[PDB]
Amino acid sequence: STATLCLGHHAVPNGTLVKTITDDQIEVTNATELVQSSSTGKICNNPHRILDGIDCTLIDALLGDPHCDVFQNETWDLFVERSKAFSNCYP
Amino acid sequence: PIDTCISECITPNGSIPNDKPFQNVNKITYGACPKYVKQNTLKLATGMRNVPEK
Amino acid sequence: GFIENGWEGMIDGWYGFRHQNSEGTGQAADLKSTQAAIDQINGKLNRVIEKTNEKFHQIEKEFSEVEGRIQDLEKYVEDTKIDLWSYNAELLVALENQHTIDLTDSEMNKLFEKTRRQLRENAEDMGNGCFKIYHKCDNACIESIRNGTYDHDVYRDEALNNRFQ
Amino acid sequence: GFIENGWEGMIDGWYGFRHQNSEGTGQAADLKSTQAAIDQINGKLNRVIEKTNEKFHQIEKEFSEVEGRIQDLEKYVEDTKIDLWSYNAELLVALENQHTIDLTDSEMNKLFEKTRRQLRENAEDMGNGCFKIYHKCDNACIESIRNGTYDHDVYRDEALNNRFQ
Amino acid sequence: GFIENGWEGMIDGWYGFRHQNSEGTGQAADLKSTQAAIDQINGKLNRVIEKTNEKFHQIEKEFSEVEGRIQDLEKYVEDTKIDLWSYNAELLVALENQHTIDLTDSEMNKLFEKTRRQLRENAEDMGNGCFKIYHKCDNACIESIRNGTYDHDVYRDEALNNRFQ
Ligand SMILES: *[C@@H]1O[C@H](CO)[C@@H](O[C@@H]2O[C@H](CO)[C@@H](O)[C@H](O)[C@H]2NC(C)=O)[C@H](O)[C@H]1NC(C)=O
Ligand SMILES: *[C@@H]1O[C@H](CO)[C@@H](O)[C@H](O)[C@H]1NC(C)=O
Ligand SMILES: *[C@@H]1O[C@H](CO)[C@@H](O)[C@H](O)[C@H]1NC(C)=O
Ligand SMILES: *[C@@H]1O[C@H](CO)[C@@H](O)[C@H](O)[C@H]1NC(C)=O
Ligand SMILES: *[C@@H]1O[C@H](CO)[C@@H](O)[C@H](O)[C@H]1NC(C)=O
């Protein structure tokens, strides 16, 4: 003689625990990470003009150290300075 | 090590994607990089309160 | 809240209806409220943090030797900026999550109230978020309720008779 | 929301009533809700940013020559402060606008509910934000509704008879 | 709001009931809503500002002589940090107070609505936040209302007869 009409919202079996103003941990249906905590470990060479300084420091490439002769007139957007750079000239 | 790839944000740890607004890799950055924060994770809810059956 | 349970069987949308009448149980999703909530959520971070700013030349942040005053000042500046940005991130995420939760609760309540206003006197709220309608309401009736064009006047007499005898 | 349209002809206040009865259509504004919203809005920025702070002697922010470390540090400090304050301004304005909008919606809903509670059983909510009252309600009746002293008990019998026949 | 007055005689909880029937006036407190509000309030500052950070070696912040550029820079850095943190504190306290007030108002409204839904047709909202129940409701009835297991169906006939005559 009569009908029935229920109302509801979708749920999921497992939810993600987020933090709000009034809760340390509250479970929601979905959540996205906002902090990028991992790196690919390699430097992309575009769109920035990268200059890898092999065994050369910036000052060594500037002054003209022999093993830095290849760095004359170089240009860069980012100069990447390796830990293995060394000086081999007059102290 | 240098690589043949596309990325706008460079850290000493390598290139990272700049789609997220924050990063916890390194405070030394170059390019259109996210801001460095001390927290390694911050989850933003993209759904409703989750009340499952039972 | 008064729904007390979500529907994991609901995959059509976020909010929807489950009806049961003489013909048989049926289920559908309300696209407008789900789409509204998704649209209001789809951004929600580009509207405050427009983008990643672009930094090219900065101070040194790692030191080999020990200089003194200037290295201390550089360390202090970097630490202050890092702490302030961590607080900004924490507070922003907490506020956005709280507001999103309140928003979805309000959207659910708005859908419930809209349905209740369609069924002016023909239905009674059973209190568990589910309406008992007091007249013949077939699948065309139900899809008119879901449509938003439910004509309450033509069932008013039958509904009132069922209610008040 | 359920009002679906604003009233550009309303200049008396922010929220108000438009009534239609046997005598004729009339319009008035509710001063208490409008005044409450305006009062809550009138400040809303002195209560967070008390004032402009007063700065007298600062660092140099424009440089002619190129020094090196110290100029880089000064540029970095100024850029960090500028970025942080821009984020603070952006977030503050977004939050205040969102809260103001929610506040005005809540005030409208509160006025609607107060009116509905004045008309306990004498009126029915038509769903478009407009009440159909089921008894003789003259201009004195309407201004009593607007006043907040509407006596629902003395129309209860007539209203119930009009409703349930 | 629609309660219009607090109860200083209420010490059992934050929100509660005062009933009056044939037996006599009684008062009790609702523990669930008060406990929920207190639980949501009990933290509310550890969830944003986790703790006090630990600073060991910093810059000099008080100077005896006058150096020049570097002392100016140090003063500027300290002043900028102090101003930014003062703004953060001010905004945080204002937002938390506003949200707490809205939260408690919502909890009061939720308790009122839950009670109203228990009394489906047996009671009428008098508009001052107080229900007039239209049937014999003894102390067991009242504590069932407070309990949340009020059986509205078995008083439906008597209540409807009292209401609509
Ligand atoms: C939560 O939202 C995210 C964001 O849309 C969903 O993740 C994406 O889902 C789409 C669906 O096809 C995929 O194409 C994307 O690759 C997903 N992104 C990532 C980063 O994995 C996620 O599925 C949603 N989860 C729930 C339970 O709703
Ligand atoms: C999904 O839910 C199950 C059980 O509820 C849980 O063990 C698991 O961690 C959740 N997440 C995934 C990705 O399976
Ligand atoms: C629903 O209503 C709209 C407009 O009132 C109408 O065009 C449509 O045919 C109806 N039925 C549907 C969408 O099944
Ligand atoms: C409205 O009500 C107040 C108090 O109940 C009364 O003083 C006043 O005369 C009434 N009529 C008005 C303001 O027109
Ligand atoms: C209240 O209800 C609960 C559960 O329905 C029951 O266990 C209890 O005996 C009732 N009476 C009380 C708590 O006085």
Author numbering:
A (entry chain C): 9 to 99
B (entry chain C): 273 to 326
C (entry chain D), D (entry chain F), E (entry chain B): 8 to 172
Task: Provide text from the study.
HA is a transmembrane viral surface protein which is responsible for interacting with host cell receptors and mediating virus entry. Three HA1/HA2 heterodimers assemble to form a trimer spike protruding from the virus envelope, with the HA2 and the short N- and C-terminal fragments of HA1 forming membrane-proximal stem and the large middle fragment of HA1 forming the membrane-distal head. Triggered by the decrease in pH in late endosomes during virus entry, HA undergoes conformational changes that underlie its transition from a prefusion state to a postfusion state.
We obtained three major conformations of the HA-Fab complex at pH 5.2 (HA-Fab-pH 5.2 conformations A, B and C) through 3D classifications and refinements. However, the HA-Fab-pH 5.2 conformations B and C showed significant differences in the stem region from those of the HA-Fab-pH 7.8 and the HA-Fab-pH 5.2 conformation A. The densities of the central helices in the HA-Fab-pH 5.2 conformation B are clearly visible, indicating that the central helix coiled coil is still stable and ordered in the structure. The densities of the fusion peptides in the HA-Fab-pH 5.2 conformation B are largely absent in the hydrophilic pockets of the central helices. These observations suggest that dropping the pH induced the release of the fusion peptides, which was also indicated by the aggregation of the particles. The release of the fusion peptide can be further confirmed by a “zero out” map calculated between the map and the atomic model without the N-terminus of the fusion peptides (residues 1–20), which shows no obvious residue density in the fusion peptide binding pockets. The conformation B has the released fusion peptides while the other domains remain in similar conformation with the neutral pH structure. Of note, the conformation B in our research has not been reported.
